Amino acid sequence: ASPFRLASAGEISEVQGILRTAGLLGPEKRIAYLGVLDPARGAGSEAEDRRFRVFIHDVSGARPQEVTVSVTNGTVISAVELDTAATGELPVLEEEFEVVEQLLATDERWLKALAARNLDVSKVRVAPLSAGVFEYAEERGRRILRGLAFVQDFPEDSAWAHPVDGLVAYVDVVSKEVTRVIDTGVFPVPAEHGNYTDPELTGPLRTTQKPISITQPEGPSFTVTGGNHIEWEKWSLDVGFDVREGVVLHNIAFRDGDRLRPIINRASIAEMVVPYGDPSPIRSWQNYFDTGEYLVGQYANSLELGCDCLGDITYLSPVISDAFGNPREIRNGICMHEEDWGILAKHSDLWSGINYTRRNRRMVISFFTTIGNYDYGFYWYLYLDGTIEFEAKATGVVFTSAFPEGGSDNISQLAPGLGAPFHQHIFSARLDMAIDGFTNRVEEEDVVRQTMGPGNERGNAFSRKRTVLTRESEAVREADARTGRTWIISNPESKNRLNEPVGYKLHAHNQPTLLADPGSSIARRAAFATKDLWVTRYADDERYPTGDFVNQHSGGAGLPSYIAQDRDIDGQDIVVWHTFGLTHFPRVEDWPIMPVDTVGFKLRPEGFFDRSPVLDVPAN
Amino acid sequence: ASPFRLASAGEISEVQGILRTAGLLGPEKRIAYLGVLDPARGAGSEAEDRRFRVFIHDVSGARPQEVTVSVTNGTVISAVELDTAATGELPVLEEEFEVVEQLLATDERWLKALAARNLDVSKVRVAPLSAGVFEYAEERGRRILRGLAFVQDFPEDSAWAHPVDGLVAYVDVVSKEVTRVIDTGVFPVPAEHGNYTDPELTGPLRTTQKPISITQPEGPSFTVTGGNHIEWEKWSLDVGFDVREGVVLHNIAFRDGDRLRPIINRASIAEMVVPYGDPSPIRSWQNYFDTGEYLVGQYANSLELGCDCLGDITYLSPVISDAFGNPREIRNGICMHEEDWGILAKHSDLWSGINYTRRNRRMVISFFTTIGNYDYGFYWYLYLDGTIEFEAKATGVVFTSAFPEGGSDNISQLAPGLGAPFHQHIFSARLDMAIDGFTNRVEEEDVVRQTMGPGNERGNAFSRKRTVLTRESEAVREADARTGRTWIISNPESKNRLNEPVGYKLHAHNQPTLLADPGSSIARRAAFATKDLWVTRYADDERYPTGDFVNQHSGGAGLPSYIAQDRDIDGQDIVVWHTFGLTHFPRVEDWPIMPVDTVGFKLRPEGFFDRSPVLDVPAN
Ligand SMILES: [Co+2]
Ligand SMILES: [Co+2]
């Protein structure tokens, strides 16, 4: 029924059948990406035509294709051949990762490098990483992966504790060729193990932690209909899932009186990049575009009740396509639950003698993914007062290297001889705004200090100013914590009872953005990460801040090219792109496994309501 | 037996007797402050002499006194006559706030102002506020309070909805006379009511919230001994309470194997200032020093189980003195409980086939206080991984005024004719550091960007830099969100296994600091609020960033004066003073009662341990 329902296993099988029937999915073809297309703006067709977009890879080297099909009509709507050397390679296939270690195991240069280090090839694991775009001419038109070595002493050993520095290989996963084997010198392989489940390292386990029971006798306060339509404490929304972006929220609206008021049409993390700041040739090319190159949704974990999600949990099990077009279910990949959130409002009034206390609550929608050594949790929160918040949780095992004798300015020491290259975790939240409708605008709000003098004799006055961003060219903004800078998305045509445009204020954490030199390959490929906020005019084909094909793709697509159109964004259908991230210098406390570190943002109502919208919350 | 135990009702009664017998507690005398003194540096002094510090006010105008008494020996250690015109006035007595409304009620000027506005004096509540500034010469060393009027239509009515603008009066609480009544003009008194418990405003109460049951079948994981000594998941500390500072944490330490390692000797909010940015002569003097002038501990609320504190809660009922030396218990004034805090660490490793997930927990110690229209929650958190965090929760009813016809640049509109003056809530956390002992130092850490070139050909490198603050004259620092600036407190004499000085990193929220003009009275009296971080050499008499007698003091006292000593802080007994606060531009959503807003800071271990200290946490 709902045109925002999750993709079904049947729809995926249908896409596969349509492509096979069209002669677009023979045995040499692979599905590198498959996702349902969101409905276009304005009710076009009488009914909703379900469409899917697919990126088809060819394991023989032939040009890949981008195809859109209608599962309803069983037809190919469009099919275009992709010139990858220009517009970018398709996302890495899970099956291509295993090609690397296999190939390298039979390469003489690789074997000689390991022998020189007295390492048994059978114990050397290879982390196959995205290649990016650098100065290797031969890589032009080649689907490459770069492998870094780690030693695994036994089946359950954490190889991350044993990096093999000074060695890196480049592999053509299609032609099955080892293009280069670079050895800059033999580094001792860190000896200490990092097995956090080994009693030897954990010591006796604590027995002091008493149980905390969290339960809901009458069940959760939220309802799920149509498979993914949520309704909770005045909130309404649809929980979507995409193999690339992961959890995506649609039609976020709030019930205000006899009307459902829209706030955000679509919210997602459109991209996330993890750049490493170690100038060593062995890793200076290392940049993970987890969303764009790897597809975070593809690796979403199956969440365990009691371990990952505690309390009364409602799960969603999204389906994605495998490399052959077969539907694959990610069992319990999405957790949904509400949780108490302390005090909401409170006041003990002397004059009236009335004491008032109300508790807060938040709806939680999340999933967790694993990208090699790291694991990322994506959490969206909805609060009773109308606030919307996102939080990324980074944990797992830090990427390691050897720690050089003379010390390092770009690597920290975790254990004897064990290093941890400095890096960042930067996300891009794409917020297709719809504050009381699509006619929106963004204002940059800065606190304003005033000089002591006439009209401000005591020098206590301070104000604020709001600057409307009217054109895309003026909509690339930077954070300014010192002036309490925030951004307000309002609707100039919808006013509250005080005759003021209704709006929502975006509060950023104001963390450092991309640190790389502006001329670096990464600064260009991850241009979005160089600025805190971008505002574009909505367009069907502007989905990711890095464009559709990130893998081995130069700059040229994404936000910078969108912005150039310099479209009108003052009272129009707009999209806010917020960059936020973590800057890491790994501590010894982060080894052998790092505790969760968080970063995010939130939007709170700003004159959206006519008064507090939580006066109807009971005392219970 | 602990020297850090909470003051008993008996100790306060004993202080009362000692003072009375010494002839220091005559009919005209009042106790403006009474608190137990912390042990001096030096455990050599076997058997601690329980001493109390007392500020004795004289309602007759006679000079007040500062008296130290030994409850152990039942004697007066010392009694010094106070010169308020020089060192400042004593905290405001609750009985004094009352005299303001009573006096004005018989003043012809006040009655005429009300008559002109057709306001029945019996329905006009007067908010008694501190002088706020220092200027008016005529206030010749007079103990004064200012009064702002609010109309309360009926006993259970919220007067805050009906401010009487254009009117303000000054009163000498000791001579009991109205020195001035300023009427700058009639402003309509906002008509709408702000009664959040009135059905006509709340509408039908929601019935959609299902219960969330949080219980601990085997009880809490923390233990309380000696009445206030807490032990929880390796943490050890003493929870103290002062009528001025509220909850104070003592001897915060962490059990690292065989030894109990100190981190922070004493942690507290030493001061809290609420400056208003409305240039109107009616409020341009408005500045609350909740901690220094009002004493936040004095107005601590009794926390209701199931409303203010949910789950398995352990309470502490601190005792304070009233204006006459009688002990008054604040039943359930302090809440203590542990709570689940999501995922602590997680990693699904492909190579080892091991999936690992651990939950996090936090120990919570808090209290709530009410200052007129506002209510503040002070929360301290201890996490499993060794992180310490503080969080202030601001809620209650916003201070109101009339909303000027024609708008305003320093006041927002909450309802028809109802305004909310812009203002800030700025706290000062006093952290008497003790990282593995008292020999500490502070380093400012900034992220460092690097230029592409030799040694960084790909332009991907980035580093960090640390600068030791060696003298107090250079220990007045500003935040810098852009360079991810943090401050590390380390012990140059205690190193981790990597031969690195152990330490803790302070992460600030980087919110705007005091916005008032540098030449304003408030900028002088609350100089601490103009900079994010101060570092001083420990001194027994350097307790508050604003000095001991904040009320009506000319300014410069506190931090600016301490810092002026320019003492050595490089590897010494030091104290960190962190300024953090909220800047508020009240929204319609904040009326009639505002949702909790938060601000705080946290300290995370930085090479304090030899590896993660939570590897011994069980899976459960
Ligand atoms: Co990291
Ligand atoms: Co406020």
The 10 Å Cβ neighbour count of residue A385 is 21
**In what helix (H) or strand (E) does residue B257 lie, and over which residues does it extend?**
none
Q: Do residues A202 and A260 both lie within one domain?
A: yes
Q: Between chains, do B583 and A484 touch, taking CB under 8 Å as contact?
A: yes
Does A440 appear as a known binding residue?
A: no
Provide the number of structural domains found in chain B: 3
| Closest ligand to residue B400's CA | 2
Spot the catalytic one: B170, B276, B374, B538: B374
Size of interface A-B (CB pairs under 8 A): 447
69-128 in A: which are within 8 Å (CB) of B? 125
DSSP state of A82: -
Q: Is B8 helix (H, G, I), strand (E, B) or coil?
A: coil
| Closest ligand to residue A424's CA | 1
Contacts of B27 (CB under 8 A, 6+ apart): none
The 10 Å Cβ neighbour count of residue B602 is 17
The 10 Å Cβ neighbour count of residue A40 is 11
Q: Which of B195, B215, B230 is the last residue of a domain?
A: B195
**Cα diameter, chain A:** 86
Spot the catalytic one: B38, B242, B278, B290: B290
* A61 Rama sector, left if φ>0, alpha if ψ -120 to 50, beta otherwise: left
The 10 Å Cβ neighbour count of residue B440 is 29
Cβ density class B65-87: b for 16+ within 10 Å, e for less: bbbebbbeeeebeeeeebebeeb
* CA dist., res. A209 & res. B196, Å (int): 41
How many H-runs (helices) and E-runs (strands) does chain B carry? Answer: 7, 34
DSSP state of A107: -
Radius of gyration (C-alpha) of chain B in whole angstroms: 26
Q: Do residues A101 and A210 both lie within one domain?
A: no
C-alpha distance from residue B284 to each of A84, B168, B422 (Å): 65, 11, 11
Structure tokens at B172: 């000498």
Q: Do residues A595 and A559 both lie within one domain?
A: yes
Could you give the residue ranges of the DSSP H alpha helices within B316-411?
none
Q: Do residues A79 and A120 both lie within one domain?
A: no
Q: Do residues B357 and B401 both lie within one domain?
A: yes
**In what helix (H) or strand (E) does residue A342 lie, and over which residues does it extend?**
strand A334-348
The 10 Å Cβ neighbour count of residue A213 is 15
Q: Is A217 helix (H, G, I), strand (E, B) or coil?
A: coil
DSSP state of A305: B
* CA dist., res. A459 & res. A436, Å (int): 39
Chain A residues closer than 8 Å to B258 by CB: none
| Closest ligand to residue A598's CA | 1
Q: Between chains, do B616 and A204 touch, taking CB under 8 Å as contact?
A: yes
How far A108 CA sits from the closest chain B CA (Å)?
24
* CA dist., res. A374 & res. A393, Å (int): 10
Cβ contact A585:B464 at 8 Å: yes
User: What residue has token string 């051949």?
Assistant: A81
* CA dist., res. B370 & res. B116, Å (int): 33
Cis peptide bond prior to B592, omega within 30° of 0: yes
Cβ contact A238:A382 at 8 Å: no
By C-alpha distance, which of A506, A616, A427 is closest to A263?
A: A506
Chain B residues closer than 8 Å to A213 by CB: 213-217
Q: Is B220 helix (H, G, I), strand (E, B) or coil?
A: coil
* Amino acid identity, position A569: I
Q: For the domain that residue A7 is a member of, what is the CATH number? A: 3.10.450.40
By C-alpha distance, which of A248, A249, A378 is closest to A308?
A: A378
Q: Is B167 helix (H, G, I), strand (E, B) or coil?
A: strand
Tell me, in angstroms, the distance from the centre of ligand 2 to residue B272's CA: 13
How many H-runs (helices) and E-runs (strands) does chain A carry? Answer: 7, 34
Structure tokens at B363: 């120990």
By C-alpha distance, which of B132, B241, B246 is closest to B550?
A: B132
By C-alpha distance, which of B561, B594, B401, B252 is closest to A356?
A: B594
* Amino acid identity, position B162: H
By C-alpha distance, which of B464, B483, B485 is closest to B532?
A: B485
Report yes or no: A464 at the B interface, CB cutoff 8 Å.
yes
Tell me, in angstroms, the distance from the centre of ligand 2 to residue B58's CA: 34
DSSP state of B304: P
* Amino acid identity, position A325: G
**In what helix (H) or strand (E) does residue A172 lie, and over which residues does it extend?**
strand A167-172
C-alpha distance from residue A545 to each of A84, A285, B290, B569 (Å): 18, 20, 47, 48
* Amino acid identity, position A286: Q
How far B543 CA sits from the closest chain A CA (Å)?
27
* CA dist., res. A253 & res. A255, Å (int): 7
Chain B residues closer than 8 Å to A212 by CB: 214-216, 311, 338-340, 361
Q: Which of B375, B462, B618 sits opposite A206 (nearest CB)?
A: B618
Q: Between chains, do A201 and B594 touch, taking CB under 8 Å as contact?
A: no
* Amino acid identity, position B381: Y
Report yes or no: A155 at the B interface, CB cutoff 8 Å.
yes
* CA dist., res. A458 & res. A167, Å (int): 66
Chain A residues closer than 8 Å to B350 by CB: 370, 372
By C-alpha distance, which of B100, B205, B193, B201 is closest to B144?
A: B100
Work out the angle at residue B444's Cα, subtended by the Cα atoms of residues B443 and B450, and round it to the nearest 5 degrees: 120
C-alpha distance from residue B97 to each of A181, B102, B126, B179, B343 (Å): 81, 9, 9, 16, 48
Q: Between chains, do B461 and A277 touch, taking CB under 8 Å as contact?
A: yes
Q: Between chains, do B216 and A211 touch, taking CB under 8 Å as contact?
A: yes
Q: Do residues A301 and A173 both lie within one domain?
A: no
By C-alpha distance, which of A134, A161, A155 is closest to A146?
A: A134
396-455 in B: which are within 8 Å (CB) of A? 396-397, 409-410, 413, 415-416, 422, 447, 449-452, 455
Structure tokens at A434: 């719809």
Q: Do residues B183 and B266 both lie within one domain?
A: no
Cβ contact A486:A505 at 8 Å: yes
Contacts of B338 (CB under 8 A, 6+ apart): A212, B220, B221, B222, B232, B361, B362, B363, B364
Q: Do residues B511 and B386 both lie within one domain?
A: yes
Q: Which of B29, B55, B87 is the last residue of a domain?
A: B87
User: What residue has token string 């254990």?
Assistant: A415
Helix %, strand %, coil % for chain B, to 5? 15, 45, 45
Radius of gyration (C-alpha) of chain A in whole angstroms: 26
Q: Do residues B248 and B349 both lie within one domain?
A: yes
Work out the angle at residue B185's Cα, subtended by the Cα atoms of residues B184 and B187, and round it to the nearest 5 degrees: 125
| Closest ligand to residue A277's CA | 1
Structure tokens at A460: 């206590």
**In what helix (H) or strand (E) does residue B202 lie, and over which residues does it extend?**
helix B199-202
* CA dist., res. A506 & res. A469, Å (int): 15
Q: Do residues A260 and A366 both lie within one domain?
A: yes
* CA dist., res. A82 & res. A450, Å (int): 57
181-220 in B: which are within 8 Å (CB) of A? 196-197, 201-220
Q: Do residues B239 and B280 both lie within one domain?
A: yes
**Cα diameter, chain B:** 86
Q: Where are the strands (E) in A245-333, listed by range?
A: 246-256, 259-275, 287-289, 314-316, 319-321, 327-329
Q: Which of B195, B211, B230 is the last residue of a domain?
A: B195
* CA dist., res. A220 & res. A235, Å (int): 14
By C-alpha distance, which of B69, B54, B170 is closest to B110?
A: B170
Structure tokens at A197: 């489940």
Q: Which of A212, A347, A461 sits opposite B397 (nearest CB)?
A: A347
Q: Which of A354, A452, A615 sits opposite B202 (nearest CB)?
A: A615
* CA dist., res. A414 & res. B446, Å (int): 21
Chain A residues closer than 8 Å to B618 by CB: 205-207, 209
Cβ contact A2:A314 at 8 Å: no
Chain A residues closer than 8 Å to B354 by CB: 156, 197
213-252 in B: which are within 8 Å (CB) of A? 213-221, 233
Burial of A224 (0-12, 13-18, 19+ CB in 10 A): middle
Structure tokens at A336: 């949904």
Cβ contact A282:A184 at 8 Å: yes
Pick among A153, A286, A343 to test the B interface (most B CBs inside 10 A): A343
* CA dist., res. A96 & res. A32, Å (int): 11
Cβ contact A338:A218 at 8 Å: no
Q: For the domain that residue A554 is a member of, what is the CATH number? A: 2.70.98.20
How far B445 CA sits from the closest chain A CA (Å)?
11
C-alpha distance from residue B124 to each of B100, B120, B144, B235, B322 (Å): 12, 7, 20, 51, 27
Concerning whether B290 is annotated as a catalytic residue, the answer is yes
* CA dist., res. B570 & res. B563, Å (int): 14
By C-alpha distance, which of A65, A57, A62, A68 is closest to A29?
A: A57
* CA dist., res. B214 & res. B311, Å (int): 5
Tell me, in angstroms, the distance from the centre of ligand 1 to residue A518's CA: 22
DSSP state of B294: I
Pairing of strands A476-477, A486-495: unpaired
Cβ contact B571:B441 at 8 Å: yes
DSSP B332-359: T-EEEEEEEEEEEEEEE-TTT--EEEEE
Q: Where are the strands (E) in B349-461, listed by range?
A: 355-371, 374-383, 388-396, 401-402, 411-415, 418-421, 423-433, 441-449
* CA dist., res. B8 & res. B17, Å (int): 14
Burial of B153 (0-12, 13-18, 19+ CB in 10 A): middle
How far B360 CA sits from the closest chain A CA (Å)?
9
Q: Do residues B66 and B150 both lie within one domain?
A: no
Does A120 appear as a known binding residue?
A: no
* Amino acid identity, position A217: P
Q: Count CA atoms within 13 Å of residue A490 on its CB side.
A: 25
| Termini Cα distance of chain B | 37
For residue A533, the cross-strand partners are A477, A578
* CA dist., res. A124 & res. B176, Å (int): 87
Q: Is B299 helix (H, G, I), strand (E, B) or coil?
A: helix
The residue segments making up the domain with residue A4 are 1-87
* CA dist., res. B54 & res. B31, Å (int): 7
* Amino acid identity, position B176: K
Q: Is B326 helix (H, G, I), strand (E, B) or coil?
A: coil
